Paper text:
[name] (SpdS; putrescine aminopropyltransferase) catalyzes the transfer of the aminopropyl moiety from decarboxylated S-adenosylmethionine to putrescine, leading to the formation of spermidine and 5′-methylthio­adenosine (MTA). In this work, X-ray crystallography was used to examine ligand complexes of SpdS from the malaria parasite [name] (PfSpdS). The active site of SpdS is located between the domains and consists of two interconnected clefts for binding dcAdoMet and putrescine. A conserved flexible structural element called the gatekeeper loop covers the active site of the enzyme.
In contrast to the other inhibitors tested, the complex with BIPA was obtained without any ligand bound to the dcAdoMet-binding site of the enzyme. In the structure containing only BIPA, electron density for the ligand was detected in the active sites of chains A and C but not chain B, presumably owing to crystal contacts with the neighbouring asymmetric unit restricting the conformation of the monomer. In addition, the gatekeeper loop in chain B was disordered and could not be built into electron density. Despite the different scaffold, the benzimidazole moiety of BIPA occupies the binding site of the dcAdoMet aminopropyl group. Although BIPA has no inhibitory activity at 1 mM (unpublished data), it is unique among the ligands studied to date in crystallizing with PfSpdS when bound alone, despite anchoring only the N-terminal part of the gatekeeper loop. The remaining part of the loop has a conformation similar to that found in structures with ligands bound to both parts of the active site. On the other hand, the complex with BIPA shows that ligands with certain scaffolds may bind alone to the enzyme and still form the interactions required for loop stabilization. The binding mode of BIPA, on the other hand, enables a different manner of loop stabilization. Thus, one amino group of the imidazole ring appears to stabilize the N-terminal part of the gatekeeper loop by forming a hydrogen bond to Asp196, although the backbone carbonyls of Ser197 and Ser198 and the side chain of Ser198 are also at a hydrogen-bonding distance. The absence of interactions with Pro203 at the other end of the loop may be one of the reasons that BIPA is a poor inhibitor of SpdS.
Author numbering:
A (entry chain A), B (entry chain A): 41 to 321
Write the structure that this text describes.
Amino acid sequence: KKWFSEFSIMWPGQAFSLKIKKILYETKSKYQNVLVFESTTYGKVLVLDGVIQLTEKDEFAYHEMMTHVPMTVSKEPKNVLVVGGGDGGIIRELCKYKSVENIDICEIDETVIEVSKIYFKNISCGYEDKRVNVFIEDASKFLENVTNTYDVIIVDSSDPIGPAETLFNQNFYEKIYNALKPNGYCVAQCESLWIHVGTIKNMIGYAKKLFKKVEYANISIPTYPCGCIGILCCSKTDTGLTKPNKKLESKEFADLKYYNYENHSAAFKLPAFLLKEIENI
Amino acid sequence: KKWFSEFSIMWPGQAFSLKIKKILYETKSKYQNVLVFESTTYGKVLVLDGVIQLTEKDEFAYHEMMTHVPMTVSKEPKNVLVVGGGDGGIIRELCKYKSVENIDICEIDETVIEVSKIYFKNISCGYEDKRVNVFIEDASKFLENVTNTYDVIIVDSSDPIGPAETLFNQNFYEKIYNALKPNGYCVAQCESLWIHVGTIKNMIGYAKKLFKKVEYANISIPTYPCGCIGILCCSKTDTGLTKPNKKLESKEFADLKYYNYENHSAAFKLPAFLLKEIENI
Ligand SMILES: NCCCCCc1nc2ccccc2[nH]1
Ligand SMILES: NCCCCCc1nc2ccccc2[nH]1
């Protein structure tokens, strides 16, 4: 049996590998290389341009946190945008909120969505929900053209090497700002504090031009590089995203496996060296 | 340039690798294989029986948390035992406390200590401190024979495959209990919540026979398997180890890179699925 190994110039000198039980699908889409495999111990795995995007065993950590942080703080969110996220995980977590009326997703590569619907049915199950609308389209263009404004935007982007390159700059954060309601919130994937501190500092600077509160949270997830990944958290209000305004107590949330009320706030208590790096931004 | 790869039956189906800048020392001691290398990006690395024990880049996370959790809760700790920990990292963090009068360490393999003194000088620097006493000896035997009792015991053990096999059972926890002062505390390395939940549950059960409060905390550290490792936290008192009784404000603590007052408590807020697993223990 072979192993899959994840190498990258974004994490030089380190690699993470999973043993392959069997290869399920590979293709070269118009935008990237797509690989899907059953691992021996982490279930099925999705790989894009040789970087792991999710595994069945741990995906709930990243999807629950990315979704329920902003959604428990937004009072009455009605319209939510997901940028990237073709796998559907964020959407699955959003659909649990009865109050949400519309969910839009903007994903440039429809092959990601289709592969997720076929091979990852417990992740892509939200696509059946009537409130969900799909747009196959560059996120920049989508944000420039959309007429609606949103209560929450969740940027579930890949890394800056690839089609997600455009989602890590100042202009983008402007468009997000203009696309949010006046009390609206954006959370975005924002890399590992163990290795990408330069990026984290840049993203925070970009966000601080526009938003009045920019905060950063960390998630433990073994199949992203260095075992964690953070959330850049942007608020148009004094008060920010560190404290939930509700508890997820109805039956649709009984199955949550990571998120809870306490660990929402705990995710924002960061290692001392990171506080120091981002103190005078 | 070659890569080092960390395989194990304790984490089947996954491996983590670091690129080797150069090999510095290898030997077979009486107890295990010892390898030391300079990595391209994580500095120097110590390997025991093919498992990473520390790297210079991230060791502060595990050593600060393991030490300052119990030491900020113990009111006036005078005598502290470290079990295992031949590298010296815990000792380095202990020496920062002016109030401590004695530090004993019990490590079975003196080659670990000696290699750390030669190759890892910013880790093994506490061995120069006059309060430090070294015992080359099985921990079980040491605990059976010691006459003194301790304010804090820190069990910085390797994994259960190896000489640290004896440190993961009921009898051991008895001896620790008998070796502590009546208000004393023990913290112990207790594995990754992402993969070793059976072990975490067993260790907690063992501890709960004896101690009136057993709690579990998590540390983010990229070079241990799954990117995190936990602390089993044992208290003879109602009150436990989740809340510090002091702040580390004197000049000897200004250099801390992970631990702070807030993230002490935050480390005990665990993922929902782990709470559920250990609820009826
Ligand atoms: N190296 C960290 C990678 C994090 C990726 C998170 C993620 N997973 C995705 C799946 C489909 C589309 C966009 C995505 N963004
Ligand atoms: N797979 C997790 C390994 C954790 C090891 C922590 C550790 N590092 C050590 C260095 C010297 C002696 C005992 C040690 N215990």
